[PDB]
Design a protein around this motif. Structure first.
Motif, PDB file in Angstrom:
ATOM      1  N   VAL A  27       0.856  -1.172   0.000  1.00  0.00           N
ATOM      2  CA  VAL A  27       0.000   0.000   0.000  1.00  0.00           C
ATOM      3  C   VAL A  27       0.901   1.234   0.000  1.00  0.00           C
ATOM      4  CG1 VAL A  27      -0.232  -0.222   2.526  1.00  0.00           C
ATOM      5  CG2 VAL A  27      -1.778   1.321   1.255  1.00  0.00           C
ATOM      6  N   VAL A  28       0.531   2.193  -0.837  1.00  0.00           N
ATOM      7  CA  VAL A  28       1.273   3.428  -0.991  1.00  0.00           C
ATOM      8  C   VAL A  28       0.324   4.587  -0.670  1.00  0.00           C
ATOM      9  CG1 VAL A  28       2.912   4.604  -2.524  1.00  0.00           C
ATOM     10  CG2 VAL A  28       2.398   2.203  -2.928  1.00  0.00           C
ATOM     11  N   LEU A  46       9.563   6.959  11.364  1.00  0.00           N
ATOM     12  CA  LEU A  46       9.374   6.155  12.565  1.00  0.00           C
ATOM     13  C   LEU A  46       8.396   5.003  12.285  1.00  0.00           C
ATOM     14  CD1 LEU A  46      10.789   6.227  15.127  1.00  0.00           C
ATOM     15  CD2 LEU A  46       9.031   7.681  16.120  1.00  0.00           C
ATOM     16  N   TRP A  47       7.312   5.310  11.574  1.00  0.00           N
ATOM     17  CA  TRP A  47       6.324   4.309  11.199  1.00  0.00           C
ATOM     18  C   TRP A  47       7.016   3.205  10.422  1.00  0.00           C
ATOM     19  CZ3 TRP A  47       2.291   2.482  13.000  1.00  0.00           C
ATOM     20  CH2 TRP A  47       1.274   3.281  13.556  1.00  0.00           C
ATOM     21  N   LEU A  65       7.632 -14.309   3.921  1.00  0.00           N
ATOM     22  CA  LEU A  65       7.433 -12.992   3.322  1.00  0.00           C
ATOM     23  C   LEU A  65       8.559 -12.027   3.718  1.00  0.00           C
ATOM     24  CD1 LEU A  65       4.707 -14.376   2.960  1.00  0.00           C
ATOM     25  CD2 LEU A  65       3.593 -12.280   3.711  1.00  0.00           C
ATOM     26  N   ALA A  66       8.952 -11.151   2.793  1.00  0.00           N
ATOM     27  CA  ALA A  66      10.010 -10.165   3.050  1.00  0.00           C
ATOM     28  C   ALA A  66       9.420  -8.759   3.078  1.00  0.00           C
ATOM     29  CB  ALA A  66      11.102 -10.262   1.996  1.00  0.00           C
ATOM     30  N   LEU A  67       9.824  -7.973   4.070  1.00  0.00           N
ATOM     31  CA  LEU A  67       9.311  -6.615   4.230  1.00  0.00           C
ATOM     32  C   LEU A  67      10.211  -5.512   3.683  1.00  0.00           C
ATOM     33  CD1 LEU A  67       7.823  -6.929   7.822  1.00  0.00           C
ATOM     34  CD2 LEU A  67       6.778  -7.469   5.616  1.00  0.00           C
ATOM     35  N   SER A  77       5.333   4.317   1.486  1.00  0.00           N
ATOM     36  CA  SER A  77       4.946   2.979   1.062  1.00  0.00           C
ATOM     37  C   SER A  77       5.416   1.828   1.941  1.00  0.00           C
ATOM     38  CB  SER A  77       5.400   2.731  -0.380  1.00  0.00           C
ATOM     39  OG  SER A  77       6.803   2.542  -0.450  1.00  0.00           O
ATOM     40  N   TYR A  78       4.540   0.830   2.064  1.00  0.00           N
ATOM     41  CA  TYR A  78       4.787  -0.381   2.850  1.00  0.00           C
ATOM     42  C   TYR A  78       4.584  -1.554   1.902  1.00  0.00           C
ATOM     43  CZ  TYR A  78       4.513   3.069   6.448  1.00  0.00           C
ATOM     44  OH  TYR A  78       4.770   4.187   7.201  1.00  0.00           O
TER      45      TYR A  78
END
Lengths: 431, 46
Positions: A27-28, A46-47, A65-67, A77-78
């Motif tokens: 999600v961006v 920080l998030w 899964l890789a973050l 973006s995450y």
């Protein structure tokens, strides 16, 4: 080669490529450091850091899964990468962290251990990454008291005074639905992803809009971070550039390619078809330099950055570089433009099509958030090839000729002359 | 004998020089604005 994007309740954007071994989902959000304040500056970074916390990261590692996360100026973006088959388990981990664990990540044991990490992180940056440190301060002075001035990593003082409530306050104002876009790159189909998304209902804070602000503005100025203990001088200088979705978006990027980048130790670099190199190599005015055309939502920066150990000739470095830029308004040649087109395509290609889907997501996500779509790589080349010498001249005569500049530097910059001397070189005397 | 003509020339000379004087003051202030309003900050090194 296909850019598919549809909206149902949330805007879904994807770009498939079957030859890719992996798939990336994320999600961006349409808000970054440019949305922060001078006082909560560093909240986005920080998030990102808790999202990649040892706890949240281990949960995804068990699942295979890789973050990955990236904090920019206009966006955030995450991303979660996985195999083409586990494209569903990425969405489970995405929802589990942005709704279910939107309170489990913010524990008074996780937050403190993370805050201590971004503090040593941002400190290390300021203490040693001089080129990026200088480039960050360039944005800081160029766009002072405006959104684009805030550094992405945040400042040590606003960071150490940040609390769990600030994260929440930001999250409840920007991590909204109308300020988001779900992106998927790798090999998965558009119809494949949208189904798994339109399946799980629940809106969660729908109809809510993020807070507004004041428009970004360029201010000709400078910040000099003199430090005689550093072994070199690092400087960045630029004029107000082009915002994304600008008619001259490409003319600007081409102009930067004309002068390109350089590295005095690489034999091949010393041979490029760049006129400026005849001047700078005689006395070796620098170890390296690189031009850029940075574009953001409201504005941009066009200029160059350089590093040098020739501390008594910095004025010649600046002078020759600015005389070359003067040329863009009055005497740039057909062959310089043509050389730029070819090299711009090569670099634009290598960006838009790397062997990494996480890069693809960021590029796709960032574009769709601003113009609602993504210009195909082939569409760009059509625009690039259509640029004439007359275009570059009209652009330069508006953006470079006798225009204010912004300067930033650190290290042994005693030899970097005053503002007015640099500013005077943005043009030439004529009858 | 040059009296009448001398004073006529003086009038032109003084007008031009006065203007040039007032004008140079303005140009100097403009060329110096960046230096005059320059600001410093000290953060003692660790």
């Amino acid at each position: 080669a296909e850019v598919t994007q549809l909206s149902n309740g949330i805007v879904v954007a994807t770009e498939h490529n079957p030859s890719a071994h992996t798939a990336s989902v994320g999600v961006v959000f349409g808000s970054g450091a440019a949305n922060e304040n001078p006082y909560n500056n560093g909240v986005s970074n920080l998030w990102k850091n808790i999202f990649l916390s040892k706890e949240n990261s281990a949960v995804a590692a068990k699942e295979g899964l890789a973050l990955s996360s990236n904090i920019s100026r206009d966006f955030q973006s995450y991303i979660v990468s996985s195999l083409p088959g586990s494209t569903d388990k990425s969405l489970d981990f995405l929802n589990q962290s942005f709704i279910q664990q939107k309170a489990n990540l913010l524990s008074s044991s996780n937050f403190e251990a993370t805050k201590k990490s971004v503090l040593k992180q941002v400190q290390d940056f300021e203490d040693n990454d001089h080129p990026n440190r200088v480039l960050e301060h360039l944005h800081s002075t160029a766009f002072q008291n405006t959104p684009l001035s805030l550094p992405t990593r945040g400042t040590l003082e606003s960071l150490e005074n940040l609390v769990v409530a600030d994260l929440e306050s930001f999250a409840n104002n920007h991590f909204l639905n109308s300020n988001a876009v779900v992106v998927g790159t790798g090999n998965i189909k558009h119809e494949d992803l949208v189904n798994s998304i339109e399946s799980k209902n629940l809106s969660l804070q729908t109809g809510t809009k993020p807070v507004l602000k004041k428009k970004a503005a360029f201010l000709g100025s400078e910040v000099r971070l003199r430090d005689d203990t550093l072994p070199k001088a690092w400087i960045s200088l630029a004029v107000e550039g082009e915002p994304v979705n600008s008619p001259n978006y490409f003319v600007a990027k081409l102009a930067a390619q004309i002068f390109g980048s350089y590295n005095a130790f690489e034999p091949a670099s010393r041979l490029q078809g760049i006129k400026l190199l005849d001047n700078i190599q005689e006395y070796q005015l620098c170890d390296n330099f690189n031009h850029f055309s940075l574009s953001y939502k409201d504005s941009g920066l066009w200029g160059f950055s350089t590093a040098t150990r020739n501390v008594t000739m910095i004025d010649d470095l600046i002078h020759f570089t600015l005389k070359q830029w003067n040329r863009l308004t009055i005497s740039v040649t057909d062959t310089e433009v043509e050389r730029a087109k070819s090299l711009l395509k090569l670099q634009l290609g290598q960006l838009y099509e790397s062997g990494n889907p996480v890069n693809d997501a960021n590029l796709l996500g960032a574009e769709v958030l601003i113009k609602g779509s993504k210009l195909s790589l082939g569409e760009a080349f059509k625009k690039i090839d259509a640029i004439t010498v007359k275009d570059v001249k009209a652009w330069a005569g508006k953006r470079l000729w006798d225009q204010d500049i912004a300067i930033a530097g650190t290290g042994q910059i005693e030899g970097l002359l005053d503002y007015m001397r640099i500013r005077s070189d943005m043009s030439m005397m004529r009858w | 004998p040059e009296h009448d003509e001398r004073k006529r020339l003086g009038l032109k000379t003084v007008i031009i020089l006065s203007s040039l004087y007032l004008l140079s003051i303005w140009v100097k202030k403009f060329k110096w604005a960046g230096i005059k309003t320059r600001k410093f900050v000290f953060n003692p090194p660790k």
